[PDB]
Scaffold this active site. Structure first.
Site, PDB file in Angstrom:
ATOM      1  CE  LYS A  68      -4.089  -2.228   1.838  1.00 15.40           C
ATOM      2  NZ  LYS A  68      -5.137  -2.290   2.891  1.00 15.40           N
TER       3      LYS A  68
ATOM      4  CG  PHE B 189     -14.636   2.137   7.131  1.00 18.00           C
ATOM      5  CD1 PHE B 189     -15.210   3.139   7.889  1.00 18.00           C
ATOM      6  CD2 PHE B 189     -14.199   0.997   7.787  1.00 18.00           C
ATOM      7  CE1 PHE B 189     -15.395   2.999   9.248  1.00 18.00           C
ATOM      8  CE2 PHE B 189     -14.362   0.856   9.152  1.00 18.00           C
ATOM      9  CZ  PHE B 189     -14.961   1.858   9.883  1.00 18.00           C
TER      10      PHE B 189
ATOM     11  NE  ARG C 172      -3.155  -6.589   7.241  1.00 18.14           N
ATOM     12  CZ  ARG C 172      -3.370  -7.783   6.708  1.00 18.14           C
ATOM     13  NH1 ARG C 172      -2.879  -8.881   7.256  1.00 18.14           N
ATOM     14  NH2 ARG C 172      -4.120  -7.877   5.614  1.00 18.14           N
TER      15      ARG C 172
ATOM     16  CG  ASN D  58      -3.670  -3.320   5.706  1.00 13.75           C
ATOM     17  OD1 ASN D  58      -4.248  -2.432   5.084  1.00 13.75           O
ATOM     18  ND2 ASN D  58      -3.414  -4.509   5.181  1.00 13.75           N
TER      19      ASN D  58
ATOM     20  CG  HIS E 251      -6.595  -6.134   0.106  1.00  8.53           C
ATOM     21  ND1 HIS E 251      -7.004  -6.989  -0.894  1.00  8.53           N
ATOM     22  CD2 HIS E 251      -7.580  -6.144   1.035  1.00  8.53           C
ATOM     23  CE1 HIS E 251      -8.187  -7.490  -0.586  1.00  8.53           C
ATOM     24  NE2 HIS E 251      -8.559  -6.994   0.581  1.00  8.53           N
TER      25      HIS E 251
END
Ligand SMILES: Nc1nc2c(ncn2[C@@H]2O[C@H](COP(=O)(O)OP(=O)(O)OP(=O)(O)O)[C@@H](O)[C@H]2O)c(=O)[nH]1
Ligand SMILES: Nc1nc2c(ncn2[C@@H]2O[C@H](COP(=O)(O)OP(=O)(O)O)[C@@H](O)[C@H]2O)c(=O)[nH]1
Ligand SMILES: Nc1nc2c(ncn2[C@@H]2O[C@H](COP(=O)(O)OP(=O)(O)O)[C@@H](O)[C@H]2O)c(=O)[nH]1
Lengths: 49, 50, 428, 440, 373, 57, 428
Positions: free
Chosen positions: E96, E142, E190, E200, E203
């Site tokens: 991410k 979210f 994480r 985190n 994904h």
């Protein structure tokens, strides 16, 4: 009971063994990297060789 | 478009020659300064029957 | 320009020439697929000597392949450098070889020679200045002997102004791979005396005593053994493929190397050779190259130079080197071994050098030797022929195949009448 | 602008045309549905596709042919396969009764229910046809449809379109192999009535292409698709110089002027070069001289007749691709120098050259991708052997009235059998008259 | 003995037609043997080809058999399916925009787990392309901050192979909420490298269909994937080529570690299985200026190779000096801190390849990050 | 390997059916003509000049 | 849009037709209930050659089922493919066959032929373009001989431009199943001379010979015999129905098959007759098909083709297959057996190819052969007729049903008058 039994003779049919032995080892060292000796060996062989 | 493609081929070759000349100059200069600093350090390259 | 046509006959000839084409492709830069991928522009200097082209820069070898057994053809095709050849040059035939000179010469061997000559004729007419033909074959056995000598005969009749190189493997003294090897060897050398312009007798035992005494290998196979043959076939034809000072092609080698027209049987040699452990402790230079030529443990024909005077010695060097070194070295060889070199030919050494050495090597050299030492090979074949002939053994399958009695005696008489000059010029 | 109408007759003609228009579509870039993905390509600008494919407001490139057959299921194969949307429904004319391999049924009795509709279709395609260069007639000298409907068609097209060019691509009855017994009847009685009405007729055989596919294309078990796809290559070398541009622009009217020296002798012999099989073509030179010598080698002719047993009377070469005229000159000079190409003494100028700058396009199939090609058409005296042998077949079959009743009870009189025989006698008399050298 | 027989594909440069072959591999003594599919005959009889290992055999690999760079298509025989099938499985990794600068040791932990990487790309996520990667999350409050994260910065994405790869990478990934991961403290990616539940580490898919659909939303079979962030010309855009020997030995993560802890910044990475014509086009400037050229070229088109660009920000030492001398033995006797000094060998297995000319780095990145896809 | 065993243990024997149903045991019946199949190699079996020498400029 | 009107007569005829309809319904995809359950549209495209369309997808065979005894119709309707036929097309009669040509031709047979004409006309104008009629019956016996010839004559007079194919079961030498095979066969052949356009004589001994020797059955039944004959019957009418290249129909084959109008007697053969135990082992291809076609082993009239030269030959191949291999093998057999072909005709073979084989097979070939070797089939019946006509035996039934004495002499005169030209053309 069932395995390969006997002395093994490692040999390459197509000719790789003679292929490696007809390449000079200095060239193989050169391909691994440049060869480096001492400065005075360089000077001595520059002058008197 | 045909002569444009021919022209891209010619430009490719021109930049090929000028890049090769610059790269040859750079490699020669790098070799010279590497030999200089190795002589400073105490070693030297091996040239066949140097 | 100049070209060479590579003919290969027999299983032995097919394997040797396939490994030859591997070596030449590696030397020139042609990949297994056939597209030129080299490093220097000067590898493509003289690419016409062995390769014809195609559409798109695809270089096909100028080789004609023939045998009686369509399995060695599949072996060569399924080899690594197999999909480079012309598929119409794969002149096979659904028949038998049966290592029989009669069966390869007077019969089903000669039932294919028309198609073989058609392929050779088109490959020779698709040239401008052809220098000649090199055929790889086995002296003992069939096909390479049987159809091989017939092929030499028809090609010599059609083109009487080109050099015939014949790389032939002679039968060995210690071991035999065929019980009619003396028969086939005599009936083949009978044609080879008056036909080809230069031979290359490559004995297996002398080919392999190299692999002990210099190379120090433990288990080398024929894939290793034909590489020395390929190195010599590359080193002979090197001044007409790569530039160098004082060039020397096949016909200049032949005129400097064949004094009398029958005496053209040579012993080969390739001598930048040392074991894998002894490579780093060696002093690779022109004098040690010359010595490794002239030592009797490096050459590929089982004929002792100390058993006979040298008539001519050719030495084709490859690699950047000085000229006074090589001139003084071969003069010193002549002076040191004065008794073993003839006196009626002053300077019995032909020297040549070339610029680029083979890849993976810094200086190499090929060795060509015509001495009176080939009388041992020919005399041993003659003794074994007269051993098998005085009881008419292994001969009914020559006579039933279509061969008669009297020219067996013609072949043996030609063998002895070739042994006669190569002993009279030993004692002048 | 410069467009010619194709006509296809019989099973043989219709699937000449199926492979022919597959190759035409993939030459001009036209999709099997009837459209083109995008223009701005050498094949599909305007002047190359206007030759065969017409246009339409909704991008539809409708053919300029007629697919006529006296029986169904072959036309139904065409309109059921992948080219259903391309060909127009009336462009493929089908009958309801097979010709039964009878020239009498092809010409005299069941021809009248379809000849008016076929002439109506040809009239329409000629109405939307600005400069009509000619009609390309594709049929066989074998079965009843190609034997008889063509025999009526040349007569009607000569009545209404007398000055126009007619180029037959005829399947001639092969020397040995055959597919029928009444081929000696049908070929003779078709050639007798189309000799005076056909302008030029290139004869391509079947056993010769059998040997060509066996020897050069390296395929021991092939079919009719591999057989006449090569004839599609032939026609794509004939009628291409008016489609693309090149060094020499050879016209459809030029073939009949350069290959037909006399009114009745209009029978050239076709051959092709690169016929190599895509795992053999890239280990050879395929130069202009080699592909010129390949046509004149006495094994690559697409009809089984030997040129050594005769003398050439005309030759036209259509070079195609990246071919240079100054290797063309050397190749033709070399083929003129040697003896076994023996020309007659009444045409020392016996060659035509037509050069196209479009390389040949490979179909998904068996032929190789090559950048050079040549199609050679030779009018020669060597076809007289085949004609005399066909006359021998006809005489042996007619000497005791074999299969005569089927022909005579259908509508044809008996005297046409004797009339066609003496027509063939006059044809071979003309062939032997044009053979010997001039002595006066 | 133990044939692994596959369906292989080659493009003949002369014959512009796709040629279909059948490859045989004997692990055994390691040997290879193709077979012609059409015109059923033999092709390269069984001989030992030690360059071809076992681990590169994989559907979509572009294995270098003798001068022939064959792309794998199908299992063919299904004995080799039921043996080397489920022993390799697709996995998509999506490091991410947080710890995307820590992606070097992300890659290091990936390759330390036992994974094999096949392709690697950093992009930014567009509007529709980012919305595609939320259909599992949809209609829960979210989405807006998920969009804000996934369109904040760059994203480095990966394709991963192993046996039980999905579940075993879930074991490496840890529990979904990194707060729960920190309470557990299992040393997960994480738990060690993470901030909160919204950010985190990376994904991953939870099923095989999930892997397939997220792989298709990412690295596609069509040709449009993303901008592949470069900031194309920023007045100093030298490139590096991390080599197949490096990304087969697993030195890629430590290479990224060293080039990140040297002031330099990576901004574009792409792993591209090259062909010989493009490799020859790139290394065409090395015709005759370096003696060993062909066997440097064959390394370049041997296996996968990952290109990257390096913005020059480190003073005094530039990227050329940081890569060091071309010869690694020379570099070791020289400045013993450069990438080739501490990461490479044998002059052809240099871990990195810098742009040798200083004014010409832009043209290399315009190639391995624009011309070639 | 037949279907209607005349010597089989069945009380009713209609001697009008053949011992078999089909003359052979070929699994695929193809159902595709040559001018349907070989002419369909344009919508499929496509391989154009995909791998091209990409110019560095 | 062409079709065939199929009609069968006699208890032999009803069973041979029922097995033909089982074969065709299996081939097209028709279940015993009648609806179409197939796997491809190439079947469904041209099923209206044998199946008239009806509502609900209930395609019904267009068959005329004829006999004088209403027990074989009960057998047909109670068979496997029994609920497939029209209930009106079972035209019955509560009478006896009588095993008598006179009872078949000059009696209540003529009282039933009007209703049979009504049925066949009801079939006939429910069409667009009819090719013709196809009658199956037995010459040796009642009904199908007498009423068969009467019906052939009457529908030929009604429609004169449509082809007639008659599959006629001629008697056998080894066995006699009745005693009046001579009278019935001669009297049927008398109308078979100037009426039908293409007869295929099919003897019963040859069926057992093929089933016992080629298929290697041990107790082959009437179902197997009718299955082989129905396979030939289906393979003749193939390219009229299924797509392919070089398609051929009935009139096509007839025009290419009869040189003279009276030599319309053929002699058939179906030849993938590989035994099923060996079926997985056969390497079934075109030369195997040709050899099994052209040996004197698969021939379904009990008369040797080696006893007389072949006049004309058919070969209707089916499947995916190469026509080089077709026609090179055709000339191989034609040139190897030159003495077995009459020489005044050249190229005496027809080739036809359908692109679809019969289901269960991949390659097939139906042979239809006009030969002078059909002469022995009539020499046998001629001597067998005269040996019991000289003594006026079994004759009072024939002359008491209303037929004159002299018609026997006229029939024998017509029969050996057909014997004359098929002799005189077999020896030039
Ligand atoms: N390429 C190709 N050539 C064919 C094909 N069919 C036939 N030929 C050639 O054409 C000849 C006979 O075909 P046709 O004259 O069209 O047969 P037809 O005119 O339809 O005659 P019938 O149908 O029997 O009335 C044969 O001798 C073949 O040599 C085909 O399907 N493809
Ligand atoms: N150098 C070399 N010699 C070989 C090779 N293969 C076979 N020979 C020799 O060839 C000889 C026999 O060849 P021959 O039987 O005549 O082959 P043929 O012509 O096909 O029958 C043997 O004595 C071997 O020593 C090879 O690969 N290399
Ligand atoms: N192939 C075949 N032959 C049959 C069948 N049924 C009867 N036959 C033959 O027909 C002959 C007698 O039939 P026939 O008396 O003419 O029948 P009928 O005219 O209706 O009385 C016998 O010799 C049988 O061999 C059958 O179902 N198939």
């Amino acid at each position: 009971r069932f395995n390969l039994y006997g002395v093994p003779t490692p040999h390459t049919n197509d000719g790789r063994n003679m292929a490696k032995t007809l390449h000079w080892l200095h060239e193989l060292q050169m391909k691994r990297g440049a060869k480096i000796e001492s400065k005075r060996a360089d000077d001595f062989k520059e002058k008197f060789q | 478009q045909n002569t444009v493609v021919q022209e891209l081929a010619l430009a490719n070759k021109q930049l090929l020659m000028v890049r090769q000349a610059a790269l040859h100059q750079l490699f020669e200069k790098e070799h010279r300064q590497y030999q200089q600093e190795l002589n400073q350090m105490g070693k030297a390259f091996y040239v066949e029957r140097l | 320009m100049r070209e060479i046509v590579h003919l290969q006959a027999g299983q032995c000839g097919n394997q040797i020439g396939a490994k030859f084409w591997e070596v030449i492709s590696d030397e020139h830069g042609i990949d297994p697929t056939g597209t030129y991928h080299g490093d220097s522009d000067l590898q493509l200097e003289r690419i016409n000597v062995y390769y014809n082209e195609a559409t798109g820069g695809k270089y096909v070898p100028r080789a004609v392949l023939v045998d009686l057994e369509p399995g060695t053809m599949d072996s060569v095709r399924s080899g690594p450098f197999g999909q480079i050849f012309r598929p119409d040059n794969f002149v096979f035939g659904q028949s038998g070889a049966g290592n029989n000179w009669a069966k390869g010469h007077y019969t089903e061997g000669a039932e294919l020679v028309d198609s073989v000559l058609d392929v050779v004729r088109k490959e020779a007419e698709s040239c401008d200045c052809l220098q000649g033909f090199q055929l790889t074959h086995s002296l003992g056995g069939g096909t390479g002997s049987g159809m091989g000598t017939l092929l030499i005969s028809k090609i010599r009749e059609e083109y009487p102004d080109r050099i015939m190189n014949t790389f032939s493997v002679v039968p060995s003294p210690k071991v035999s791979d065929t019980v009619v090897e003396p028969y086939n060897a005599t009936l083949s050398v009978h044609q080879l005396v008056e036909n080809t312009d230069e031979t290359y007798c490559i004995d297996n035992e002398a080919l392999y005593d190299i692999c002990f005494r210099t190379l120090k290998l433990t288990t080398p196979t024929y894939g290793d053994l034909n590489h020395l043959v390929s190195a010599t076939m590359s080193g002979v034809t090197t001044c007409l493929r790569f530039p160098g000072q004082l060039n020397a092609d096949l016909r200049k080698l032949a005129v400097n190397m064949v004094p009398f027209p029958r005496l053209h049987f040579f012993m080969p040699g390739f001598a930048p050779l040392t074991s894998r452990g002894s490579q780093q402790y060696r002093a690779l230079t022109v004098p040690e190259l010359t010595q490794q030529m002239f030592d009797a443990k490096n050459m590929m024909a089982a004929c002792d130079p100390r058993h006979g005077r040298y008539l001519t010695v050719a030495a084709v060097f490859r690699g950047r080197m000085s000229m006074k070194e090589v001139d003084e070295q071969m003069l010193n060889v002549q002076n040191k071994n004065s008794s073993y070199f003839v006196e009626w030919i002053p300077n019995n050494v032909k020297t040549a050098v070339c610029d680029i050495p083979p890849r993976g090597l810094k200086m190499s050299a090929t060795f060509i030797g015509n001495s009176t030492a080939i009388q041992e090979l020919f005399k041993r074949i003659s003794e074994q022929f007269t051993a098998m002939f005085r009881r008419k053994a292994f001969l009914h399958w020559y006579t039933g195949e279509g061969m008669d009695e009297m020219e067996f005696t013609e072949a043996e008489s030609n063998m002895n009448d070739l042994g006669n000059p190569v002993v009279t010029r030993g004692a002048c | 602008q410069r467009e010619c109408i194709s006509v296809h007759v019989g099973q043989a003609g219709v699937q000449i045309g199926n492979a022919c228009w597959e190759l035409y579509c993939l030459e001009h870039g036209i999709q099997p549905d009837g459209q083109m993905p995008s223009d701005k390509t050498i094949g599909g600008g305007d002047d190359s596709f206007n030759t065969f494919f017409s246009e339409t407001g909704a991008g539809k490139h409708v053919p300029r042919a007629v697919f006529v057959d006296l029986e169904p299921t072959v036309i139904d194969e065409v309109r059921t396969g992948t080219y259903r949307q391309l060909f127009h429904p009336e462009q493929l004319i089908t009958g309801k009764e097979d010709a039964a391999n009878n020239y009498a049924r092809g010409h005299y009795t069941i021809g009248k229910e379809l000849i008016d509709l076929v002439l109506d279709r040809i009239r329409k395609l000629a109405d939307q046809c600005t400069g009509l260069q000619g009609f390309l007639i594709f049929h066989s000298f074998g079965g009843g449809t190609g034997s008889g409907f063509t025999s009526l068609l040349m007569e009607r097209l000569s009545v209404d379109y007398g000055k126009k060019s007619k180029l037959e691509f005829s399947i001639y009855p092969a020397p040995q192999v055959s597919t029928a017994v009444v081929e000696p009847y049908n070929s003779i009685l078709t050639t007798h009535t189309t000799l005076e009405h056909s302008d030029c007729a290139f004869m391509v055989d079947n056993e010769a292409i059998y040997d060509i596919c066996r020897r050069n294309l390296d395929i021991e078990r092939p079919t009719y698709t591999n057989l006449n796809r090569l004839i599609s290559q032939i026609v794509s070398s004939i009628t291409a110089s008016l489609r693309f541009d090149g060094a020499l622009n050879v016209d459809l009217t030029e073939f009949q002027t350069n290959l037909v020296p006399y009114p009745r002798i209009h029978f050239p012999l076709a051959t092709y070069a690169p016929v190599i099989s895509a795992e053999k073509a890239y280990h050879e030179q395929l130069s202009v001289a080699e592909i010129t010598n390949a046509c004149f080698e006495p094994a690559n002719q697409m009809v089984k007749c030997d040129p050594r047993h005769g003398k050439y009377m005309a030759c036209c070469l259509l070079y195609r691709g990246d071919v240079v005229p100054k290797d063309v000159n050397a190749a033709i000079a070399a083929i003129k120098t040697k003896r076994s190409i023996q020309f007659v003494d009444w045409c020392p100028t016996g060659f035509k050259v037509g050069i196209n700058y479009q390389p040949p396009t490979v179909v998904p199939g068996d032929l190789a991708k090559v950048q050079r090609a040549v199609c050679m058409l030779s009018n020669t005296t060597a076809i007289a052997e085949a004609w005399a042998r066909l006359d021998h077949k006809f005489d042996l079959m007619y000497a005791k009235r074999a299969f005569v009743h089927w022909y005579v009870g259908e509508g044809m009189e008996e005297g046409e059998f004797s009339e066609a025989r003496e027509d063939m006698a006059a044809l071979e008399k003309d062939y032997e008259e044009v053979g010997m050298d001039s002595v006066e | 003995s133990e044939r692994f027989v596959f369906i292989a594909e080659w493009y003949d440069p002369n014959a512009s037609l796709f040629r279909r072959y059948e490859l045989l591999f004997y692990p055994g003594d390691g040997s290879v043997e193709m077979h012609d599919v059409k015109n059923h005959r033999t092709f390269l009889k069984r001989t030992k080809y030690e360059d071809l290992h076992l681990e590169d055999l994989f559907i979509g690999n572009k294995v270098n058999v003798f001068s022939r760079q064959l792309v794998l298509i199908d299992y063919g025989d299904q004995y080799t399916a039921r043996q080397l099938g489920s022993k390799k499985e697709k996995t998509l990794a999506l490091i991410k925009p947080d710890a995307v600068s820590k992606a070097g040791e992300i890659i290091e932990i990936i390759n330390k787990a036992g994974f094999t990487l096949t392709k690697l790309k950093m992009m930014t996520l567009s509007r529709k392309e980012a919305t595609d990667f939320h259909i599992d999350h949809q209609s829960r409050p979210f989405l807006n901050e998920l969009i804000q994260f996934i369109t904040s910065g760059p994203i480095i994405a990966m394709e991963i192979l192993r046996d039980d790869a999905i579940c075993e990478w879930k074991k490496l990934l840890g529990p979904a909420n990194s707060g729960l991961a920190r309470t557990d403290a299992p040393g997960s990616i994480r738990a060690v490298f993470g901030t909160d539940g919204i950010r985190n580490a990376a994904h991953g898919p939870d099923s095989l269909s999930c892997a397939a659909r997220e792989m298709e939303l990412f690295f596609p079979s069509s040709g449009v994937c993303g901008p592949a962030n470069t900031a194309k010309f920023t007045n100093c855009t030298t490139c590096c080529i991390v080599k197949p020997h490096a990304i087969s030995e697993g030195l890629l993560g430590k290479i990224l570690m060293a080039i990140r802890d040297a002031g330099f910044e990576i901004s574009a990475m792409q792993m591209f299985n090259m062909d010989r014509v493009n490799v020859e086009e790139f290394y065409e400037v090395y015709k005759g200026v370096v003696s060993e050229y062909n066997e440097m070229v064959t390394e370049m088109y041997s296996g996968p190779c990952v290109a990257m660009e390096i913005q020059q920000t480190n003073p005094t030492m530039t990227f050329r000096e940081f890569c060091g001398p071309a010869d690694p033995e020379i570099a070791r006797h020289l400045r013993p801190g450069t990438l080739r000094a501490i990461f490479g060998k044998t002059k052809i297995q240099n871990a990195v390849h810098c742009t040798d000319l200083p004014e010409d780095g832009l043209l290399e990145v315009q190639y391995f990050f624009k011309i070639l896809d | 390997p037949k279907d209607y065993d005349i010597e089989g243990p069945e009380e009713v024997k209609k001697l009008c059916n053949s011992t078999y149903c089909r003359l052979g045991t070929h699994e695929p019946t193809v159902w595709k003509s040559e001018t349907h199949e070989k002419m369909a190699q344009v919508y499929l079996n496509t391989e154009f000049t995909e791998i091209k020498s990409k110019a560095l400029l």
